[PDB]
Amino acid sequence: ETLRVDPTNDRLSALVEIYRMMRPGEPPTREAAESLFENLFFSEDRYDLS
Amino acid sequence: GNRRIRSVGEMAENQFRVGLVRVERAVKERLSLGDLDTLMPQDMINAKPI
Amino acid sequence: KKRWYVVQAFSGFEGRVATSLREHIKLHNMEDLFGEVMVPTEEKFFPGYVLVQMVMNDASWHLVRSVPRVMGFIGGTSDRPAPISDKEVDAIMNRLQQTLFEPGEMVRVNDGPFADFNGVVEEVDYEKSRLKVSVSIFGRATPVELDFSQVEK
DNA sequence: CTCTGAATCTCTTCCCGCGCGCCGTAGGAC
DNA sequence: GTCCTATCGATCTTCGGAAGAGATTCAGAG
């Protein structure tokens, strides 16, 4: 059902949608959407389970 | 079983971490732009944020 | 062709904005993407934004916003900041290249021990490039003479 | 092709007195 | 040191409110 609701296609599409909804007014870029995604939940500066 | 107790030695630690994060934010740039030769570690940091 | 682009910058830090861009261009070695970043100044009309000679690449779009004290450019849309104009550059390069003490007038001293005081002109020391303004000392309007650069009009 | 449904968004509301206590612009240039 | 100009003009403001109602967008179809 989520697949039926998904308007995105692939990893590039995933980064584009994530970047647009995360930062309205900010243009997506392949080198930059990673800089957003990794910092979201994988980068120590902004994620740490105690 | 889902709520845990933070005490002084943890909240103070978090605040100290915040201070150090601000200090790092400044001094990373200072070291990138600094000449790194005449600089001494006292020059790198200033106590005021912490 | 590197069309100029206008960038918002921390007022009072505008010099550090231009320098912090100047370092970052070479460090990111995008020297082939930037001309110079103009901060015109007279003896700085608008404590505010900067002009950068630049091209429009997404790497350069993020590069300028990766310099400290830089929100970004001023343009129609954030996706594409716009240059200024053909003639606007020339006009700015043109300007970047291109009050008498009346008797009875009330002024303040600009410097010295009497700076920022309520004084009244008493006479005219014109040809000496000087001034003479009454002051309130000892309870009197004593005659005190000052330099020309002590005016506060 | 846009008309009445819902569906999702923003804006607004939340008793009353008393009494302490403290805390209250910032950075850098001449 | 005093006296000046200015606001994260390279962040991330707090997720532990309900609710109640309008306003604003979107369906199934005439």
Side-chain angles (χ1 to χ4, degrees), chain C:
Chain C
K1 191 183 191 304
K2 305 187 175 177
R3 313 194 64 177
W4 294 73
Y5 289 95
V6 175
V7 192
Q8 260 185 313
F10 266 163
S11 36
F13 299 94
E14 188 168 351
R16 270 64 59 91
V17 169
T19 296
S20 303
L21 174 68
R22 289 192 169 278
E23 297 287 354
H24 272 256
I25 299 161
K26 299 179 179 179
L27 298 174
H28 287 244
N29 53 85
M30 296 195 185
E31 179 194 18
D32 294 321
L33 300 185
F34 289 72
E36 47 93 320
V37 3
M38 267 186 179
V39 184
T41 297
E42 294 201 21
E43 306 180 15
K44 218 278 125 287
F45 354 96
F46 25 83
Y49 322 92
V50 260
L51 283 76
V52 176
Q53 186 173 355
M54 195 187 57
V55 296
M56 193 42 60
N57 246 23
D58 294 6
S60 64
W61 182 97
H62 303 71
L63 176 61
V64 181
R65 291 170 63 98
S66 70
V67 167
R69 315 166 200 280
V70 166
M71 179 189 301
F73 327 90
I74 294 169
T77 177
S78 62
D79 300 323
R80 296 172 174 266
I84 25 187
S85 286
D86 181 19
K87 53 182 179 181
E88 276 187 337
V89 181
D90 322 331
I92 301 175
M93 289 174 57
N94 177 29
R95 288 190 295 271
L96 192 54
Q97 182 181 359
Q98 182 182 20
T99 68
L100 53 148
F101 50 104
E102 316 171 19
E105 144 75 336
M106 329 151 308
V107 289
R108 294 178 173 264
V109 191
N110 192 31
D111 194 60
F114 288 151
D116 244 315
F117 277 103
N118 301 269
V120 36
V121 171
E122 48 192 332
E123 65 96 5
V124 173
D125 272 353
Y126 217 173
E127 302 194 19
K128 231 277 174 296
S129 179
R130 252 180 161 272
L131 221 83
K132 189 158 180 179
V133 172
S134 160
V135 300
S136 179
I137 314 293
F138 296 157
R140 298 170 172 86
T142 170
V144 180
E145 58 181 27
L146 315 168
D147 201 324
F148 199 15
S149 297
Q150 314 287 358
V151 292
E152 182 237 38
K153 184 49 183 173

Side-chain angles (χ1 to χ4, degrees), chain B residues 3 21 25 29:
Chain B
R3 297 150 52 85
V21 163
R25 254 174 170 86
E29 170 196 345

Side-chain angles (χ1 to χ4, degrees), chain B residues 12-29:
Chain B
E13 159 186 333
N14 290 275
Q15 295 292 139
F16 190 86
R17 196 193 188 283
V18 171
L20 243 300
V21 163
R22 299 178 175 178
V23 155
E24 154 194 355
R25 254 174 170 86
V27 64
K28 260 174 182 177
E29 170 196 345

Side-chain angles (χ1 to χ4, degrees), chain B residues 35-49:
Chain B
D35 49 7
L36 308 185
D37 295 310
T38 179
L39 300 183
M40 290 191 61
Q42 69 239 58
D43 323 323
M44 308 301 291
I45 50 92
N46 65 284
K48 293 308 172 185

